[PDB]
């Protein structure tokens, strides 16, 4: 009960900021997550023995791929920690419990390939889940791990509180399917503009948690330039491997995934910042004013990619 996790001074202070990088020491990431759970939820919401076993099983079920890995899991959980900690009063007890777990689990057993490649490969997962293919898989792996002996971190919830938190986690993980982000942000934009946005409407909360999930998932574009630039290498290493596998199926991949079109990456980044990232953090800042630092950091990185194009780096 009285066993508080504590971080060294620089991490204790910088973990509270949106642009925090969890560092290269793999063995510190479990402790960084528990620290975050304890401060954003309480020391009481999870049994430490159960939580520690859950985290290490989640870790084991992330693969050794360049980007969609255990470090991405904990990074996305940290962005969610920063949002919850900057919006203390807006979220229920179950939401704070569900969302950090949802983030940690959101890419469980990711192979480094898009839903599109699974569909063109004719992977069994594409027959089992026709849309949001990997995202339904990620949720399935979350439930599987929750059901390992000694792993039910929610076992002290009632039947209905339990069904409510698994429902928060399912929607939250499904929302990380970027195909669903565009329509979701459009609706939130319209609801915000016409003043119909109502956080007491459960269907509106769902939408707002969806956009938070997109924002946490994309959060590599909200880091300091050196973190963002170096993460871009891991992201594109997966895209190019997928491009290679597309060519193996006799399909010319989109330029984003062609390692022969490596020259077009800077302009591809501008497109993504303008089409996806900036719109995402703008709508999020409108709904949750204190998440503005994510928008500001995003804009700073868009400017850094413009500088790359102009040969200024
Ligand atoms: C062709 S499209 O629809 O425009 C399209 C689709 C998917 C990613 C991208 N794309 C391009 C360039 C990029 O730097 C990123 C990026 C930045 C941060 N994270 N990710 C990202 C990477 C890999 C997978 C992901 C990603 O976020 C996700 F959670 F959405 O799933 N993403 C673009
Ligand atoms: Cl607090
Ligand atoms: Mg994903
Ligand atoms: Zn992700």
Swiss-Prot record:
Chain sites annotated for binding 3',5'-cyclic GMP: 68, 269
Domain of life: Eukaryota
Disease: Dyskinesia, limb and orofacial, infantile-onset: An autosomal recessive, early-onset hyperkinetic movement disorder characterized by axial hypotonia, dyskinesia of the limbs and trunk, orofacial dyskinesia, drooling, and dysarthria. The severity of the hyperkinesis is variable.
Name of the protein described by the UniProt record: cAMP and cAMP-inhibited cGMP 3',5'-cyclic phosphodiesterase 10A
Binding site for a divalent metal cation 2: 107
Domain notes: The tandem GAF domains bind cAMP, and regulate enzyme activity. The binding of cAMP stimulates enzyme activity. Composed of a C-terminal catalytic domain containing two divalent metal sites and an N-terminal regulatory domain which contains one cyclic nucleotide-binding region.
Residues of the full protein shown: 724 to 1036 of 1055
Effect upon mutating residue 107 to N: Reduces activity 1000-fold
UniProt similarity note: Belongs to the cyclic nucleotide phosphodiesterase family.
Tissue expression notes: Abundant in the putamen and caudate nucleus regions of brain and testis, moderately expressed in the thyroid gland, pituitary gland, thalamus and cerebellum.
Subunit structure: Homodimer.
Binding annotation for 3',5'-cyclic AMP: 68, 269
Annotated localization: Cytoplasm, Cytosol
Residues of the active site: 68
TM regions (residue ranges): none
Binding positions for a divalent metal cation 1 per the UniProt entry: 72, 106-107, 217
Function: Plays a role in signal transduction by regulating the intracellular concentration of cyclic nucleotides. Can hydrolyze both cAMP and cGMP, but has higher affinity for cAMP and is more efficient with cAMP as substrate. May play a critical role in regulating cAMP and cGMP levels in the striatum, a region of the brain that contributes to the control of movement and cognition.
Residues covered by the PDEase domain: 1-312
Coiled-coil ranges per UniProt: none
